[PDB]
Amino acid sequence: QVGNPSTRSVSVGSLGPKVFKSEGINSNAQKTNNESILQASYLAVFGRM
Amino acid sequence: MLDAFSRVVVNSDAKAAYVGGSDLQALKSFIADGNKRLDAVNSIVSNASCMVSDAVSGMICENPGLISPGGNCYTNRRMAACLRDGEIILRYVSYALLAGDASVLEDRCLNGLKETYIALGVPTNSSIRAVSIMKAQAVAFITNTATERKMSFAAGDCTSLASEVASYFDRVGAAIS
Amino acid sequence: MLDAFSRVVVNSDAKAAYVGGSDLQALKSFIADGNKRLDAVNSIVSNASCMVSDAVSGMICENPGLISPGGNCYTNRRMAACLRDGEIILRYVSYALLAGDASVLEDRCLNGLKETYIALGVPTNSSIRAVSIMKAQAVAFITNTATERKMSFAAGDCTSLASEVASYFDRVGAAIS
Amino acid sequence: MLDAFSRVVVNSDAKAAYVGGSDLQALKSFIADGNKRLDAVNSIVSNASCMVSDAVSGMICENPGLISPGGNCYTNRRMAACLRDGEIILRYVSYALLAGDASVLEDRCLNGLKETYIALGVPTNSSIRAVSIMKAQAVAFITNTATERKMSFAAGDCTSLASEVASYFDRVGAAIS
Amino acid sequence: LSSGSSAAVPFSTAVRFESPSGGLDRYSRVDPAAPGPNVITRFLFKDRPVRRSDPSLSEVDREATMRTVYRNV
Amino acid sequence: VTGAVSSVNMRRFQRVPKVSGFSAKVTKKNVNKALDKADMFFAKSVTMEGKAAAIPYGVYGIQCMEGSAKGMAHEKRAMALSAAFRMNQRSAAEKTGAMYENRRLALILAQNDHQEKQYIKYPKLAAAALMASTEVTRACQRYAVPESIEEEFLAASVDKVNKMRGTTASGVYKSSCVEGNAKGQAEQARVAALAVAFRSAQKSASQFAAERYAQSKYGRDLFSSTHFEEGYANTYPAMAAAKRASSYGY
Amino acid sequence: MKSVITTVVSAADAAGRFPSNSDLESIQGNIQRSAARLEAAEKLAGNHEAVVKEAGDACFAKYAYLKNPGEAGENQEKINKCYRDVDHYMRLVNYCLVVGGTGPLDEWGIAGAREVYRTLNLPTSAYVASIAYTRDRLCVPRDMSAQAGVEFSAYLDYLINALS
Amino acid sequence: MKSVITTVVSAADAAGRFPSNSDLESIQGNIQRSAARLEAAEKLAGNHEAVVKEAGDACFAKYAYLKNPGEAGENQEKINKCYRDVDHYMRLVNYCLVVGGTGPLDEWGIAGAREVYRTLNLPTSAYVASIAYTRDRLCVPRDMSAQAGVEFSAYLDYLINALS
Amino acid sequence: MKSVITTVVSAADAAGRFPSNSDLESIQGNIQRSAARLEAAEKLAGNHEAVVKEAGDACFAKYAYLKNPGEAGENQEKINKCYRDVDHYMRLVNYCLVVGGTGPLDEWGIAGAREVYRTLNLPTSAYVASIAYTRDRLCVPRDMSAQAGVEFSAYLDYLINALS
Ligand SMILES: *C(=C)C1=C(C)[C@@H](Cc2[nH]c(/C=C3N=C(/C=C4\NC(=O)[C@H](C)[C@H]4CC)C(C)=C\3CCC(=O)O)c(CCC(=O)O)c2C)NC1=O
Ligand SMILES: *CCC1=C(C)C(=O)N[C@H]1Cc1[nH]c(/C=C2\N=C(C[C@H]3NC(=O)C(CC)=C3C)C(C)=C2CCC(=O)O)c(CCC(=O)O)c1C
Ligand SMILES: *[C@@H](C)[C@H]1/C(=C/C2=NC(=C\c3[nH]c(C[C@H]4NC(=O)C(C=C)=C4C)c(C)c3CCC(=O)O)/C(CCC(=O)O)=C2C)NC(=O)[C@@H]1C
Ligand SMILES: *[C@H](C)[C@H]1/C(=C/C2=NC(=C\c3[nH]c(C[C@H]4NC(=O)C(C=C)=C4C)c(C)c3CCC(=O)O)/C(CCC(=O)O)=C2C)NC(=O)[C@@H]1C
Ligand SMILES: *[C@H](C)[C@H]1/C(=C/C2=NC(=C\c3[nH]c(C[C@H]4NC(=O)C(C=C)=C4C)c(C)c3CCC(=O)O)/C(CCC(=O)O)=C2C)NC(=O)[C@@H]1C
Ligand SMILES: *[C@H](C)[C@H]1/C(=C/C2=NC(=C\c3[nH]c(C[C@H]4NC(=O)C(C=C)=C4C)c(C)c3CCC(=O)O)/C(CCC(=O)O)=C2C)NC(=O)[C@@H]1C
Ligand SMILES: *[C@H](C)[C@H]1/C(=C/C2=NC(=C\c3[nH]c(C[C@H]4NC(=O)C(C=C)=C4C)c(C)c3CCC(=O)O)/C(CCC(=O)O)=C2C)NC(=O)[C@@H]1C
Ligand SMILES: *[C@H](C)[C@H]1/C(=C/C2=NC(=C\c3[nH]c(C[C@H]4NC(=O)C(C=C)=C4C)c(C)c3CCC(=O)O)/C(CCC(=O)O)=C2C)NC(=O)[C@@H]1C
Ligand SMILES: *[C@H](C)[C@H]1/C(=C/C2=NC(=C\c3[nH]c(C[C@H]4NC(=O)C(C=C)=C4C)c(C)c3CCC(=O)O)/C(CCC(=O)O)=C2C)NC(=O)[C@@H]1C
Numbered sequence A: 001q002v003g004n005p006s007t008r009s010v011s012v013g014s015l016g017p018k019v020f021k022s023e024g025i026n027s028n029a030q031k032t033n034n035e036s037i038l039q040a041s042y043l044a045v046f047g048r049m
Numbered sequence B, C, D: 001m002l003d004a005f006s007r008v009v010v011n012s013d014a015k016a017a018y019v020g021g022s023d024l025q026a027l028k029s030f031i032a033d034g035n036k037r038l039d040a041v042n043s044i045v046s047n048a049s050c051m052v053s054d055a056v057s058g059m060i061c062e063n064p065g066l067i068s069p070g071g072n073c074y075t076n077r078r079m080a081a082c083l084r085d086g087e088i089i090l091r092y093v094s095y096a097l098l099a100g101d102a103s104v105l106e107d108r109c110l111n112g113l114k115e116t117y118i119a120l121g122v123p124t125n126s127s128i129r130a131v132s133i134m135k136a137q138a139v140a141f142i143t144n145t146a147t148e149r150k151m152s153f154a155a156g157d158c159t160s161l162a163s164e165v166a167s168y169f170d171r172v173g174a175a176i177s
Numbered sequence E: 001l002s003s004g005s006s007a008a009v010p011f012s013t014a015v016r017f018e019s020p021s022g023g024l025d026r027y028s029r030v031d032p033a034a035p036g037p038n039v040i041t042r043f044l045f046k047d048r049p050v051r052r053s054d055p056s057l058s059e060v061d062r063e064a065t066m067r068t069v070y071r072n073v
Numbered sequence F: 001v002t003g004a005v006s007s008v009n010m011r012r013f014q015r016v017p018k019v020s021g022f023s024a025k026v027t028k029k030n031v032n033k034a035l036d037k038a039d040m041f042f043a044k045s046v047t048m049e050g051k052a053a054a055i056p057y058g059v060y061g062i063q064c065m066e067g068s069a070k071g072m073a074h075e076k077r078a079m080a081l082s083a084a085f086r087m088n089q090r091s092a093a094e095k096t097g098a099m100y101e102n103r104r105l106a107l108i109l110a111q112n113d114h115q116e117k118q119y120i121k122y123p124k125l126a127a128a129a130l131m132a133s134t135e136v137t138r139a140c141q142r143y144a145v146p147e148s149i150e151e152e153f154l155a156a157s158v159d160k161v162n163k164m165r166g167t168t169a170s171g172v173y174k175s176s177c178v179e180g181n182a183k184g185q186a187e188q189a190r191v192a193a194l195a196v197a198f199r200s201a202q203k204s205a206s207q208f209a210a211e212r213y214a215q216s217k218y219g220r221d222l223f224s225s226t227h228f229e230e231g232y233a234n235t236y237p238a239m240a241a242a243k244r245a246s247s248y249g250y
Numbered sequence G, H, I: 001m002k003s004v005i006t007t008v009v010s011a012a013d014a015a016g017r018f019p020s021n022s023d024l025e026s027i028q029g030n031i032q033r034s035a036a037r038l039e040a041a042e043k044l045a046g047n048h049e050a051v052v053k054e055a056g057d058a059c060f061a062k063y064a065y066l067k068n069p070g071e072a073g074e075n076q077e078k079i080n081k082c083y084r085d086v087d088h089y090m091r092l093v094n095y096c097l098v099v100g101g102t103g104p105l106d107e108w109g110i111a112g113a114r115e116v117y118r119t120l121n122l123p124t125s126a127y128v129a130s131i132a133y134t135r136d137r138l139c140v141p142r143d144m145s146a147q148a149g150v151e152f153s154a155y156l157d158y159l160i161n162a163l164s
């Protein structure tokens, strides 16, 4: 990031933490993970429940 | 035809009210996500020749009676008119994604499409599977999750455009059936 | 007629697939929503006698050509039939919200409603207003923003249920357009 | 029809009594043992095809003049109508075991059954033996003591529901006696 | 409906001549998904012709239709 | 010889369907006539299988006689064909009102989702399956005989309020309930209805007992929605068979 | 008598089927929801001398034109029979909570009442003010539980929409 | 498509009524039993190619007469169509565990089956010899939970009581 | 009892008509064809224990799976109940050869047989292999006349088609 500022938003893959995306990728395309993303955003801010 | 802006005008004209600040902010959210809407129409149109051949050869891959003798996609004269018909369905959906309203699709493509396929003998169970493969191709190209073609975008959520384009493919499928 | 659970098995039948654990949590989200969905269809059927009195009396003051001599809702026989059809339309939206699918709305009520009204001579401009008045009355009573009456729910967010019931009410207007 | 909840109401209506706590605890232990009632009536319906074939072929096995030329089960037209009647009787006991009351069996089936069978010449003694075989079949399926099939249940004692279905096969056995 | 009608009279003509020709930009009925001609011509440098596809025919396309009527017809 | 080319009105049947504009208006009319006389083939084929229950082994039963005299069968033809002429003289409140009355009753009657799909699309298929369900199981009003004298008074009270829906709202008669349309044509139907009343009492021992249990089912899953109406259908099956549908105003 | 057991059997009888897995699944909702409508049944059993008197004068607060001669309610036995009606209507709601359905209000309370109230020249708007008083005089955590008040005030406004 | 919802909507649609509390009480019972059958539905979808391989040779080892010339399964084309049909019935049991009703079996696997296996001379006790092997090989506490067996074995026995 | 007599009389009873010359001309064919069918009836009536012994052990020579335990023909007291029915079907062929029409096969041996044989798990292909053994054990100059064996095997083909 100090020599490649364009790499922000590029998923590092298996070496970083797991990223989160409210995608909703289905043929009717709705997000199935409204539960878990709320469970994961509580841990990004507070770090626990 | 109408777009997403003049849909709000004709709903407000039925009550003789000025469209004011109480519902302009649901049109300001159309503008503020307007770069991602154009970012997504570009990802469909760049792949649209490969989308209508992965579709109608997957319709043959799941129903081999179309290329049997007497079938709908049997000869060369008939296969070219199905491959033509795939990219008029895909072309009119991308006019409606770019407009944010489906009224160009309902007034110029799905106006008598059912009564034309009845008089031609086009099998309606196989023309749902051609559209519903193309729905799963589009949502994989909006949300950037196609396996054989990866693109590059800025970070941020765009599943509200993949779900709008999936519901335009559920009006093609629910007007011919 | 169909519901939410039977809609996702007639699409898996079309590609001859088992309904495995990829689209089961789309259905497990429907069951956890179930106490909010059942809490909310009670809200419309508790107020449904007043929702048809607030709708068709709003239409006769916006358009006073309906009580004109020779109108649609002119005589006392015709006022009772317009008061009947407002409650037939609200009854089939209430089946669609409870089922989670617009299948019972589309065929048992809306299939043939357009040329019924063409043969009867119902002005179809007025019927879009009186079904959109009830759409505003639905989402006021879902999300508890009704001014004269409040109902006792638990605390939470149900704007997806209010926008789903607004999706059925303008499906009525598209059929009779 | 009526059920176990509706019987208490129409009993208490004649005294103009409110349903208080003197007779709600009979209904409370109806619901608290309600998971064994659904565990009971599932075991009957899961064996209801074999419980007519073990019944009316054991009725002819103890009275072999029924298939003699002149008998009630002589032709294939008449043996099929006894096999039809052997599963209408088992169906309305299943409607009475689930509802917990014998009003769906009495009014819909047994009203005029004895005055039907004496205008058709059905033998009203061997018909009791086909019923009373089925009572012995059912209570070995309630208490899981059938000698050829063992269903998996939880532990406990459910002898009050084997004696209620034995009380339902005698209201039909006294209806045509 | 009034004046602007036809003459039906299928026969109408009366002469047994030798046949003149047609164009080539016609509806073919075999391969109707074809471009044919008018892809390499001076069709590309005219404005494209107006066919009615809308049932409503909005009032700025109504005026744009009749300008083509006075120019071409 | 003339020079006779094929006409402009005859060459237009060879044209391929297009998809929008005025060229979609031709294909919308040609399909809605091809769905109308496919709907007539749907209603004819159902009636030809309900009529195969009155020919149960190959011989014509007593249910499907026409009239008993010499010219008592030809005049049963000549007032069925004028009964269908007055059927399509009703206004739009009766044609569309019977379409939705039949569509409520045909979907109770259906046994699968394919059957209940087709009663929605095809109106004459659903109208000729309400009648074809009742002519098989003999749940009609021309087949039920009252086996009491309170049962005859109970069925006449149901049939008293069915005879006012063949009258209008001000109280004058419709054209829905008409016996005679010519000179002396009413009395020929008086003769033909007294004859088919006599054959209804000539049924078998089990044919009387199957239609006791069929008229109780017909009155309790098509016209009863409470528990007191179920008591008038489970004990008096002749008043449960005089409950007609509200499509025909008889 | 529409209830939750007497409509899944009465629909399985019309097709001639046995009670299936769909039919037993509907009865298990009358195991989970039964503990709240029977919780509101004892509360109406122990308060119906109070709440009927509380709803009776709520009619006479709104309509004071009943008691005048020339108008209707001029004497005593026209007044004490009004408490006879609304104690019946509270009794049928108490019947409705026990069965798990809207059965007893339908065939006993609702059916035919639009002809009885018209022909006897009773104002039908006087009935609905007494029912809607008890829909507002209920506060939910003091009197009963949370899901007992949503059951008890679901039959009250069912009676209100069936009246007018 | 008989389920818990489609019963109580069409019972109210034939009656001409709004959804009342007896209709919503049934959908509450669809919530509680939903954990047991959707555990059985996901167990069947991830195991089915080993289930129908083991069910189909419980027909062809019991009834060894079917591979004589002139019989049902006399060549490998007709044997492969027998495993096609056990896989169609195990797929329709999987849809019945999702909808919670016999509706997928009632319209895609049972209606017309007696009028098809007769006229193509298919032995209907060779299908039931494979469904009943599946119902008896199911041990409860290894394969699924306790009440995931009582939903899975009840839809197998609805297929057995409707075939034979 | 669909005869040539009962067909044209009941069809004349539906119009309410006298027997006309089309009706009498059909009974003239009954005085033409009855010499062949009553010859084949009396050939069957004097040889029936020889031919249902020969038919029924062609069923168990082909379908030897029935003599397994748990199957159909598993003890001796129901193998004897199998030859009871082959004697029952040949007796109904002999009755309908007398009346000249399919009526005794129709309403005494067929009309309800598919409900019964399915419920008692009796294979209807074993019934076909007995009836289609005697159709081609027959040789037309030795056993009866030429036209007596035409009408005898034609009434067996009605029994093969109504079970298949
Ligand atoms: C049989 C031989 C046969 C099939 C079966 C069928 C397979 C199939 N594929 C899809 C999905 C997609 N096709 C896509 C198109 C392309 N992918 C690319 O990356 C390039 C640009 C383009 C083709 C050249 C895409 C994007 C998808 C979506 C899934 C993905 O992750 O890639 C389906 C649809 C699934 C459904 O039924 O819903 C099927 C059935 N094709 C065959 O040839
Ligand atoms: C059980 C009902 C039935 C079936 C099935 C069938 O094929 N025929 C009827 C019984 C039947 N009817 C006749 C003769 C006539 N029937 C009529 C009246 C019908 N014809 C019509 O066109 C209409 C209006 C649509 C009706 C109701 C008429 C006029 C006759 C002819 C009478 C005559 O004397 O010619 C017959 C006898 C015909 C035959 O030869 O089989 C039967 C068996
Ligand atoms: C069906 C295959 C079920 C099943 C049903 C049961 N039948 C039961 C008892 C019973 N069996 C007979 C024998 C009868 N059948 C014959 O074929 C002949 C001979 C021709 C005879 C006599 C009779 C008479 C009875 C009833 C006893 C009585 O009269 O009271 C029975 C209960 C007893 C038990 O199982 O121990 C059942 C459950 N049995 C099964 O296991 C499958 C699933
Ligand atoms: C292909 C995926 C189908 C299938 C298609 C066929 N369509 C044939 C002719 C045809 N298609 C249309 C509709 C198309 N034209 C439009 O203008 C628009 C929308 C604006 C659409 C969707 C029309 C109008 C026609 C007839 C006139 C023409 O061909 O131009 C066709 C040829 C029939 C034949 O000759 O055999 C085929 C095969 N068949 C299939 O199996 C899949 C489902
Ligand atoms: C008032 C809000 C309307 C209006 C309404 C009128 N509708 C009239 C008759 C009518 N409506 C229906 C459809 C209805 N019946 C059903 O069974 C179902 C679906 C299950 C629906 C939607 C029918 C079939 C009929 C005709 C039969 C009848 O009389 O009930 C009507 C009467 C016409 C007249 O006699 O004057 C009126 C006035 N008119 C309006 O413009 C507003 C928008
Ligand atoms: C079998 C265990 C008997 C026997 C029975 C026969 N019953 C016959 C006809 C019949 N049964 C009923 C009653 C039944 N139908 C219903 O709808 C209901 C309840 C809702 C019940 C209990 C009726 C109404 C009828 C007449 C209708 C019909 O034809 O089926 C019958 C046919 C008589 C015949 O054709 O010879 C028989 C043989 N006979 C027996 O041996 C045992 C004891
Ligand atoms: C009861 C269902 C109806 C009713 C119907 C009417 N039937 C009339 C004449 C008629 N019906 C039959 C029976 C035959 N027609 C069929 O469509 C089927 C099954 C698909 C069958 C078995 C016949 C043979 C006839 C001709 C007349 C005769 O029997 O002599 C008819 C017109 C004459 C009349 O008014 O009786 C009607 C109205 N009648 C009713 O009351 C309910 C509504
Ligand atoms: C295997 C245990 C059997 C057996 C089976 C055969 N079935 C044959 C044909 C067949 N089966 C069905 C029913 C099945 N197919 C479906 O699509 C569905 C529902 C979705 C079901 C339940 C059908 C409709 C057909 C005809 C079409 C087809 O061929 O798939 C079959 C071929 C018979 C023939 O020669 O025509 C066989 C051999 N045979 C066995 O050995 C055991 C009894
Ligand atoms: C031998 C081919 C089979 C076999 C035969 C069995 N048939 C059994 C019963 C049965 N069959 C009929 C129809 C037949 N009986 C008649 O009276 C007439 C004509 C008037 C016909 C065509 C009936 C009505 C019955 C039931 C009564 C009876 O026992 O006779 C049968 C008994 C059923 C059982 O034991 O469960 C058998 C055993 N089945 C075999 O075991 C071999 C393979």
Ligand SMILES: *[C@H](C)[C@H]1/C(=C/C2=NC(=C\c3[nH]c(C[C@H]4NC(=O)C(C=C)=C4C)c(C)c3CCC(=O)O)/C(CCC(=O)O)=C2C)NC(=O)[C@@H]1C
Binding pocket: I043, I044, I047, I050, I051, I054, I134, I137, I138, I139, I140, I142, I143
């Ligand atoms: C005809 C030349 C055939 C042929 C015939 C043979 N049949 C032999 C014995 C046999 N066949 C029958 C059945 C037959 N007899 C009847 O009474 C009736 C029905 C009324 C029929 C269909 C019986 C009962 C018998 C045993 C003694 C007898 O009556 O003849 C036969 C003797 C050897 C043997 O049993 O196989 C012959 C040669 N065989 C042929 O090759 C041609 C095709």
Ligand SMILES: C=CC1=C(C)[C@@H](Cc2[nH]c(/C=C3N=C(/C=C4\NC(=O)[C@H](C)[C@H]4CC)C(C)=C\3CCC(=O)O)c(CCC(=O)O)c2C)NC1=O
Binding pocket: B032, B033, B034, B035, B036, B038, B039, B040, B042, B141, B142, B143, B144, B153, B154, B155, B156, B157, B158, B161
């Ligand atoms: C003429 C043609 C033309 C285009 C094609 C678009 C191209 C385009 N897309 C984006 C910009 C963006 N594009 C995305 C889009 C995506 N990110 C995702 O994760 C999804 C996979 C995907 C779309 C489906 C996002 C999240 C942004 C930044 C947010 C924003 O819109 O400001 C931007 C930057 C806007 C800015 O400067 O902030 C541009 C120029 N605009 C044009 O003028």
Ligand SMILES: C=CC1=C(C)[C@@H](Cc2[nH]c(/C=C3N=C(/C=C4\NC(=O)[C@H](C)[C@H]4CC)C(C)=C\3CCC(=O)O)c(CCC(=O)O)c2C)NC1=O
Binding pocket: B015, C047, C050, C051, C054, C057, C058, C060, C061, C062, C132, C133, C136, C137, C140, C141, C145, C146, C147, C148, C149
């Ligand atoms: C000619 C003058 C005249 C009118 C303008 C109307 C008044 C009217 N009220 C509502 C609107 C409404 N009407 C109701 C109905 C009710 N509110 C309650 O709390 C009660 C329980 C129930 C009636 C008894 C509700 C809930 C709304 C939504 C707005 C709100 O009140 O919060 C609307 C719809 C707004 C829209 O168009 O989107 C109109 C037009 N009636 C008239 O006579």
Ligand SMILES: C=CC1=C(C)[C@@H](Cc2[nH]c(/C=C3N=C(/C=C4\NC(=O)[C@H](C)[C@H]4CC)C(C)=C\3CCC(=O)O)c(CCC(=O)O)c2C)NC1=O
Binding pocket: C032, C035, C036, C038, C039, C040, C042, C142, C143, C144, C153, C154, C155, C156, C157, C158, C161, G033, G147, G150, H020, H021, H022, H024, H025, H028
């Ligand atoms: C027979 C009739 C019948 C009913 C009426 C419902 C009654 C009902 N509603 C809710 C329960 C609930 N309801 C809501 C709903 C709402 N909260 C809001 O802010 C919105 C205004 C509104 C819906 C539009 C929420 C957020 C919950 C709690 C979440 C949950 O139950 O999981 C619950 C669960 C109780 C709890 O968990 O606390 C029940 C039983 N069920 C029935 O059987």
Ligand SMILES: C=CC1=C(C)[C@@H](Cc2[nH]c(/C=C3N=C(/C=C4\NC(=O)[C@H](C)[C@H]4CC)C(C)=C\3CCC(=O)O)c(CCC(=O)O)c2C)NC1=O
Binding pocket: D032, D033, D035, D036, D038, D039, D040, D042, D043, D141, D142, D143, D144, D153, D154, D155, D156, D157, D158, G024, G025, G028, H033, H147, H150
């Ligand atoms: C809608 C579908 C549906 C069903 C089919 C049943 C299924 C079922 N049965 C039982 C549970 C039980 N079932 C029995 C019954 C029996 N045990 C025996 O030893 C006897 C042989 C047999 C009588 C038939 C007993 C004794 C219990 C446990 C105790 C009890 O529930 O009271 C339970 C557990 C209840 C609990 O844990 O509280 C369940 C879920 N319930 C449902 O919801």
